[PDB]
Every structure is written in structure tokens, then in C-alpha cells.
């Protein structure tokens, strides 16, 4: 229960943070957004792809 719910909370937090950090940008490069969120480039790329899809 804790694992699943905390994973869902982590997903929600990542979504909110990514949406917050892309509001000013219009063509932000992935490396800068990953650094802003303090996450691996691949993880942010995958999350952004899922969010768009």
C-alpha cells in the first residue's frame, strides 16, 4: 500500500513540478529542465513523453 501510493504521489509531484517549470519556457532544452527539477535526463524525457501522449 505504502509503495504504490507513494509512487503515485511521486508521479503527481513530478507532473506538477514539470508543468510549473515549463510555464515560462516555450522551447526549453531538456537538460535545463532536468537540472531545474533535479532529475536524470532520461527520467524527465520519459515523463514528458508520457504527459504529452
Amino acid at each position: 500500500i505504502i509503495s504504490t501510493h507513494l509512487a503515485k504521489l511521486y508521479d503527481n509531484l513530478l507532473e506538477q513540478n514539470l508543468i510549473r517549470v515549463i510555464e515560462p519556457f516555450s522551447r526549453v532544452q531538456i537538460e535545463h529542465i532536468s537540472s531545474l527539477i533535479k532529475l536524470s535526463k532520461a527520467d524527465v524525457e520519459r515523463k514528458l513523453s508520457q504527459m504529452i501522449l
Binding site: 510549473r20 519556457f25 516555450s26 522551447r27 526549453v28
Partner: protein
């Protein structure tokens, strides 16, 4: 108790008193007790209790005969409270009230300090319709001339052109922070901790005004030029612009890849054709008006 250094105990003892309950005592003495309670609370650093006490004391009573000292002290205490909170516009309103006091008005130095602080706190206050109206009202004060640099700064913050932070500092740092015997510098921008915080806030206000000017005039300013004109590092300028955009203060689209800060809102085809139609209608109306004037001119010089 205060004379013995036990400020907390004195504040605790004086807070328990309910001056408003003492209806027998004269109104002036009640207001003095409220002011003393507010001063003790602010000394204890209980700003919430100070705010409650200040709300206890009315403002209409200050329109009386011998309430000059009471008004001065109450407005100084409220200035302290709102300075700790950080609301510069309320501080400016309080200093304007202080500057209106006849005792402050009569003496040259007192009103001069009040007006200097009012101009500085209008400058520091965030841009807004209310703040813009307050600046407009303060600017049209003939007495501002006696303080040249402060009125010059006030005008500079209303002119629609960029002011560079480096140039503004080189021009006004001596006159605004340190002062001179002929320039009685205020404590608003002093060297104390609050002084440095308010100096940084003034720099933030200057950069905000610069960004507003660019958004009004520019359409696509590179990040390098924006940073140069705002007197900030590229990353810091980008962060400030992003913070402004998130709050909805200004519209911008930071294209970090090419360093583009395009300001123009997207031009939907409907709006573009509407602008073209408005231009055509204005042209037609102006052509008719010029034809009417042309007929008049031909008529007169037969």
C-alpha cells in the same frame, strides 16, 4: 520593569490591560495607552498582537486639537510594523499621513524627511494601479522641488524608458544611502540588514520596470541583451523573468535554445485581419475628413 531590562514581563503585564474597557478615562489617555501597548508589543516582536492593538485604535480621532504627538507616534509604530511585514505601499501611506501632520508640515527638516521617505517608499512599492495613482498624486507636489534628487528619481520611475541600475547607482548612491549635511539621507536604504534587504528590493523594482518597458516596446530581445539592460547575469535574468511570467505579471516566452524572449502574444488570424480592417476604416475616415477640409480650402481661396 522596562527600565530594568525585563521587556517581556512589562509587555505581558501591559497586554492584560483592556484600555477600551476603561470607558471613564478620557479618549486621549486611552489612545496613549493603546500606543504604549503597541510599542511594547513591537519591542517584544509580537507583530500579530501589535496589529490587533493598532486595529483597536481608530484613525478619525487623530483629527483633533492636540493629537499631533499621538498621530506621529502611532504612524511611526505602524510604519515599523508594516516595514517588518514588508508592505511598502502601506508604509508610504503612513509616511504621507505623517507628512500631512501640521507639526511635520511647519518644520522644514521634518517634512523634508517625510517627503523623502514617501518618495522612496512609493518607488519601492510594487507596480499596480493603486501604486501608479499614488505616484501620480505624489509627483504633482510643488514642495518636492526642495529635494532635487528624490523628485528626479520619482520622475525617472514614471518615464517610459529604461534606467540602468549601474547608472542609477552611480548617480544616486551617495545621495540616497549616505547623504550629506545638505542631503539628509534617510534610513530607508541604510547600511543595516533591513537597509540591504530594501536596497535589493529597489534593484528588483528597477529590473521589473525595465522588463515592463521592454515588454511594452520590444518584441524579441535576446537573453544577452535583456541581461545587459537589466544589469543581471543571464541565468539570474532568466529566473527573474520566469518568476514574473508565472505570477502573470507580464507575458513572455523564454526560448532558452536560441535565447529569445519574444513578448508578442500569438497573432490569431481573426485579430490580424481585424487590425487590418481597423486600419482600413481609419484610412477611409481620414480620407473623408481630408476631402472635407480640401473642399473648404478650395472654397475659401476662390
Amino acid at each position: 520593569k522596562e527600565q530594568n531590562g525585563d521587556v517581556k514581563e512589562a509587555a505581558s503585564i501591559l497586554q492584560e490591560l483592556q484600555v477600551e474597557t476603561y470607558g471613564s478615562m478620557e479618549k486621549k489617555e486611552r489612545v496613549e495607552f493603546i500606543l504604549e501597548q503597541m510599542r511594547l508589543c513591537l519591542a517584544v516582536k509580537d507583530y500579530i498582537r501589535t496589529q490587533i492593538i493598532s486595529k483597536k485604535i481608530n484613525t478619525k480621532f487623530f483629527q483633533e486639537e492636540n493629537t499631533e504627538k499621538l498621530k506621529l507616534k502611532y504612524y511611526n509604530l505602524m510604519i515599523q510594523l508594516d516595514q517588518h511585514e514588508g508592505s511598502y505601499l502601506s508604509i508610504c501611506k503612513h509616511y504621507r499621513a505623517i507628512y500631512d501632520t501640521p507639526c511635520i508640515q511647519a518644520e522644514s527638516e521634518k517634512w523634508q524627511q517625510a517627503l523623502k521617505s514617501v518618495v522612496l517608499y512609493v518607488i519601492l512599492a510594487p507596480f499596480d494601479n493603486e501604486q501608479s495613482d499614488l505616484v501620480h498624486r505624489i509627483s504633482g507636489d510643488k514642495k518636492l522641488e526642495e529635494i532635487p534628487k528624490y523628485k528626479d528619481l520619482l520622475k525617472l520611475f514614471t518615464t517610459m524608458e529604461l534606467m540602468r541600475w549601474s547608472t542609477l547607482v552611480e548617480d544616486y548612491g551617495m545621495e540616497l544611502r549616505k547623504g550629506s549635511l545638505e542631503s539628509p539621507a534617510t534610513d530607508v536604504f541604510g547600511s543595516t540588514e533591513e537597509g540591504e534587504k530594501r536596497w535589493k528590493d529597489l534593484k528588483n523594482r528597477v529590473v521589473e520596470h525595465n522588463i515592463r518597458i521592454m515588454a511594452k516596446y520590444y518584441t524579441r530581445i535576446t537573453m544577452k541583451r535583456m541581461a545587459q539592460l537589466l544589469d543581471l547575469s543571464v541565468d539570474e535574468s532568466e529566473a527573474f523573468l520566469s518568476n514574473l511570467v508565472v505570477n502573470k505579471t507580464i507575458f513572455a516566452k523564454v526560448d532558452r535554445l536560441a535565447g529569445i524572449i519574444n513578448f508578442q502574444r500569438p497573432k490569431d488570424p481573426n485579430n490580424l485581419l481585424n487590425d487590418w480592417s481597423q486600419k482600413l476604416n481609419s484610412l477611409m475616415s481620414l480620407v473623408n475628413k481630408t476631402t472635407h477640409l480640401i473642399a473648404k480650402e478650395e472654397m475659401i481661396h476662390n
